[PDB]
Design an enzyme around this catalytic site. Sequence first.
Site, PDB file in Angstrom:
ATOM      1  N   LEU A  44       0.824  -1.213   0.000  1.00 15.03           N
ATOM      2  CA  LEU A  44       0.000   0.000   0.000  1.00 15.03           C
ATOM      3  C   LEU A  44       0.853   1.255   0.000  1.00 15.03           C
ATOM      4  O   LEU A  44       0.378   2.324  -0.392  1.00 15.03           O
ATOM      5  CB  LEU A  44      -0.935   0.028   1.229  1.00 15.03           C
ATOM      6  CG  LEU A  44      -1.969  -1.098   1.298  1.00 15.03           C
ATOM      7  CD1 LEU A  44      -2.662  -1.115   2.652  1.00 15.03           C
ATOM      8  CD2 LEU A  44      -3.002  -0.935   0.209  1.00 15.03           C
ATOM      9  N   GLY A  47       7.189   3.596   3.904  1.00 11.26           N
ATOM     10  CA  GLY A  47       7.612   4.603   4.861  1.00 11.26           C
ATOM     11  C   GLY A  47       9.126   4.621   4.939  1.00 11.26           C
ATOM     12  O   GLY A  47       9.782   3.745   4.380  1.00 11.26           O
ATOM     13  N   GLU A  51       7.020  -0.562   5.867  1.00  8.19           N
ATOM     14  CA  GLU A  51       6.387  -0.982   4.620  1.00  8.19           C
ATOM     15  C   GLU A  51       4.973  -1.429   4.987  1.00  8.19           C
ATOM     16  O   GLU A  51       4.791  -2.266   5.866  1.00  8.19           O
ATOM     17  CB  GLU A  51       7.180  -2.096   3.944  1.00  8.19           C
ATOM     18  CG  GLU A  51       6.944  -2.189   2.446  1.00  8.19           C
ATOM     19  CD  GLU A  51       8.163  -2.685   1.691  1.00  8.19           C
ATOM     20  OE1 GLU A  51       8.026  -3.649   0.912  1.00  8.19           O
ATOM     21  OE2 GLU A  51       9.256  -2.110   1.876  1.00  8.19           O
ATOM     22  N   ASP A 155       2.557  14.250  14.036  1.00  7.04           N
ATOM     23  CA  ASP A 155       2.740  14.046  12.604  1.00  7.04           C
ATOM     24  C   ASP A 155       1.432  14.211  11.838  1.00  7.04           C
ATOM     25  O   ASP A 155       1.155  13.449  10.916  1.00  7.04           O
ATOM     26  CB  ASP A 155       3.380  12.690  12.301  1.00  7.04           C
ATOM     27  CG  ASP A 155       4.010  12.639  10.917  1.00  7.04           C
ATOM     28  OD1 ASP A 155       4.141  13.698  10.273  1.00  7.04           O
ATOM     29  OD2 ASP A 155       4.378  11.538  10.472  1.00  7.04           O
TER      30      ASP A 155
END
Length: 328
Positions: A44, A47, A51, A155
């Site tokens: 998908l 990062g 993953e 974040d």
Amino acid sequence: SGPVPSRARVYTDVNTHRPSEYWDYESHVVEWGNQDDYQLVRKLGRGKYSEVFEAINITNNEKVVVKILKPVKKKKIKREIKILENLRGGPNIITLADIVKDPVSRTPALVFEHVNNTDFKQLYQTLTDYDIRFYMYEILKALDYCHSMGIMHRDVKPHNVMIDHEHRKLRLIDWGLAEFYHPGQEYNVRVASRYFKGPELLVDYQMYDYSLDMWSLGCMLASMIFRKEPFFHGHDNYDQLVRIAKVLGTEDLYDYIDKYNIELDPRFNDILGRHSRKRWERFVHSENQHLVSPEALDFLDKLLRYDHQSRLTAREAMEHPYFYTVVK
Ligand SMILES: Clc1cc(C[NH2+]CCc2c[nH]cn2)ccc1-c1ccccc1
Ligand SMILES: Cc1cc(O)cc(C(=O)O)c1
């Protein structure tokens, strides 16, 4: 004699009045389940240290999301798990369903509830004024809840917000950068994503709090109502503050740094310049006017403030006239 201390105006002592078991992630005992239960279907996204895969749980034939983590730092992994477990079941918080390690790789992996995300680049042009108000309120439910649980996401950005538009379902994801809030604590400023970084991070003011999240949410609101992504387009962390100053003005920036006795980094000397405070109305154009209103601008003005203490809390934001048209 150094910078002036600061503390959150809400949920200030929630971690202080709780047993260490709650906030001491390092002492948290992780139990890793077998990964044979889940079969990976497709990637998908990737990062920096992770993953993400779409997966099928064999035991119940149900889709799940598997976030494989590259174990560069063990403490960070424990922090995310602990925070996820603490927040598990909160409104619009991604649900950690399992914590597993593959028998051979032994690589850490987090298993989450599946979210059927509607396209980021395709949702942008169809959303109405109401939809923005609706989804902004859904994010505030997540933030008020996490802040109440003494946690700063740190974040907040479009990438970390999953929307299943068909079911009007929103989830705040990726708690990897999240931290417990302790009054007086001096945090690492190398958090969030450049465009969403609060002025406190850019000026190296370490004693920040939940209000950091509200700045990030303000950036997302500005990008959505004005159709300008990102709203503050910095090219580096120093230039990021300049982009903010070009909108908010340099006078209020000096008032902020003086209030907290912040020492401005010399890298700002030749780039900051002098900038007048712009009116929010100057960002309105033919392409975005249907998303803008006096309420939207008043709400945005109350989030995008240099002074982290002067920003609305998530609960004050939920009470704003901008949300009078949405169900609470
Ligand atoms: Cl329109 C929108 C789109 C997104 C994109 N979410 C996909 C991220 C992703 C893709 N793959 C993995 N994760 C996030 C937030 C909004 C938003 C912002 C302000 C107000 C209302 C909605
Ligand atoms: C459901 C989902 C999707 C994703 O891309 C990442 C996460 C996460 O929490 O990092 C969760």
